[PDB]
């Protein structure tokens, strides 16, 4: 269990990747 917790917080840091890189807010020049 000391384990799953180091894993759990791991899967999130990769889940955050995907979601940050593929679901980010657009950088547009519409301005």
């Amino acid at each position: 269990m000391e384990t799953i917790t180091y894993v759990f917080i791991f899967a999130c840091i990769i889940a955050l990747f995907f979601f940050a890189i593929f679901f980010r807010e657009p950088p547009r020049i519409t301005k």
Binding site: M1, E2, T5, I9
Partner: peptide
């Protein structure tokens, strides 16, 4: 092995509070 079980609760709340916190604010934003 021997670990202090309070760590879990500590380390889980660290993950949630500040996170929950920010989760509330990103919704009010939209």
């Amino acid at each position: 092995m021997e670990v202090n079980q309070l760590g879990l609760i500590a380390t889980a709340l660290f993950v949630l509070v500040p996170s929950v916190f920010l989760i509330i604010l990103y919704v009010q934003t939209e």
